[PDB]
Design a protein around this ligand. Structure first.
Ligand SMILES: *[C@@H](O)[C@H](C[C@@H]1CCNC1=O)NC(=O)[C@H](CC(C)C)NC(=O)OC[C@@H]1C[C@@H]2CCC[C@@H](C2)C1
Ligand SMILES: *[C@@H](O)[C@H](C[C@@H]1CCNC1=O)NC(=O)[C@H](CC(C)C)NC(=O)OC[C@H]1C[C@@H]2CCC[C@@H](C2)C1
Lengths: 300, 299
């Protein structure tokens, strides 16, 4: 039947991407109705990036300092304001391609699609998880800021992420569409470390169920565990504890496969203690934790 | 390195549904033609052993229901080309992108827009395996979903989905209806040949490791292409073609490591193993990133 890391179709979001330039900085913006959202650090020069007093820098800007381009057309900025780390540019034109949309803040362990853009042009789409330490393992290069992450329920696009920066370890950080960072990060040009990351246990279990659904069971065993004994071992290996809500969420996969959640926990416990002995699961040598139970259900 | 798909919007704007009787699948609407798998004309029982020419002679334009969403597109002509149906419709698709039809080589990657009832569900990156199957994610009603690459503004369609095999992998055609590999669109048991590792992509991956400063595996030797190919096949790796050497050209230039020197380095990895080390944080050599994929993500 198959299993691959699958993103939402990106077309509704592609119709909203524009280019925003201020000075010699260019990045992407999100054009909804008559407003363009983008990272506020577009207004910084080098002499500012190290400790930017954004309110003081922004009040010195005029509408005409912002060049917004949608393809071949320049949009006229008729006003601007700031919400946390996101700049909101009012334009004199409504985007006819505006989808039904909402702004959401996602929880660590939840997943979303990223539309990576450069110079206002979409380049790639891929699936990410909000890490427990509020980083994301993205593929973002110079010029990618303002790229957004999203989910689609029915015809509605829920925007949950806007891209701002890369950390020294190569992972990425950003904000929701209200401009609040995920995690303890700051939009200044400094080397920032994240909290210790952990593995998203409920997502690992969903992926093991996916592997069973696709006909692989080598990692199963005849044992079981209590929830607390599992969580003790999980935490020792820097895995997130599994809550009873997580257990409930795994119900449909448990029902579909006939493998009790706590039996799958006993399987994962053996994998954590014994490793994979060179084997692979669904093509992977590592336990994958960026598929949620909902993701697996939908795709299988 | 992520599996990264192309943005799907230009292809979403071309997806429709095609129904015959109660059999429904997806079609691709470009200008005033809709392309879809020919088995839309089969009942489920026909699919066990179809005579497509006989089935088609019994069909008329007015037996085909083509819908963009819930909006009917009237069919004004039909023809069969290999395993695809071409349905001429009375409306040119205003969202038609610049496009081309290409037949890809094994090892090449592409994005798949998985569709159901003409509605996109998700997009993901696939590699065409050397045995001409893809490790896709397809459910009932997914036939007619297409695979594609995007070059500048031009969509190059390369795959249309038709079949699942007993092993769970997937088989399909190019947009001229010619199957990849030795498969037929008949609901019968068909086996794919034993799969092999995509050497050109493993080499691309080693170049990617070098670009990122991970280069312990570079050795001082080189090899001929023929000697490498003969050794590689003993480890169930694909032989390299001249086209493979050529598409590694840019990464070879970027790193200053000749293709055949990297081949010698890979040969040593095959013959001596990893010796407990890793490459790009992995003991497994990755074979589903092409040289183009490596460039898209590094530069
Ligand atoms: C978007 O403007 C940009 C995107 C970064 C660049 C590389 N990968 C990304 O995701 N954001 C920034 O550059 C950001 C601006 C500050 C928050 C004001 N800082 C940042 O990301 O610093 C790290 C990069 C890492 C990389 C290697 C060294 C030099 C550059 C590029 C700084
Ligand atoms: C689109 O019409 C479907 C999509 C399939 C179904 C589920 N996953 C998919 O990828 N295509 C088919 O149903 C084709 C139609 C015929 C080629 C005309 N048939 C098919 O995929 O059959 C699968 C088959 C494989 C084994 C061998 C014989 C019986 C079963 C086991 C089922």
């Amino acid at each position: 039947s198959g299993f691959r890391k699958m993103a939402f179709p990106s077309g509704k979001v592609e119709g909203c991407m524009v280019q925003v330039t201020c000075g010699t900085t260019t990045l992407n913006g999100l054009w909804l109705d008559d407003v363009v959202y983008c990272p506020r650090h577009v207004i910084c020069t080098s002499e500012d990036m190290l400790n930017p007093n954004y309110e003081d820098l922004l009040i010195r800007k005029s509408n005409h300092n912002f060049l917004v381009q949608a393809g071949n057309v320049q949009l006229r900025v008729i006003g601007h304001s700031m919400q946390n780390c996101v700049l909101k540019l009012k334009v004199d034109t409504a985007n006819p391609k505006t989808p039904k949309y909402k702004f959401v803040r996602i929880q660590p362990g939840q997943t979303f699609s990223v539309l990576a853009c450069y110079n206002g042009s979409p380049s790639g789409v891929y699936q990410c998880a909000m890490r427990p330490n509020f980083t994301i393992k993205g593929s973002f290069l110079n010029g990618s800021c303002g790229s957004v992450g999203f989910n689609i329920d029915y015809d509605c696009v829920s925007f949950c992420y806007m891209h701002h920066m890369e950390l020294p370890t190569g992972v990425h950080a950003g904000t929701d569409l209200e401009g609040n960072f995920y995690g303890p990060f700051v939009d200044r040009q400094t080397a920032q470390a994240a909290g210790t990351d952990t593995t998203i246990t409920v997502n690992v279990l969903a992926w093991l169920y996916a592997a069973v659904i696709n006909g692989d069971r080598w990692f199963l065993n005849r044992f079981t565990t209590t929830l607390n004994d599992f969580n003790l071992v999980a935490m020792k290996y820097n895995y997130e504890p599994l809550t009873q809500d997580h257990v409930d969420i795994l119900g449909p996969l448990s029902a579909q496969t006939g493998i009790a959640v706590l039996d799958m926990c006993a399987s994962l416990k053996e994998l954590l203690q014994n490793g994979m002995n060179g084997r692979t699961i669904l093509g992977s040598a590592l336990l994958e934790d960026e598929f949620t139970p909902f993701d697996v259900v939908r795709q299988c």
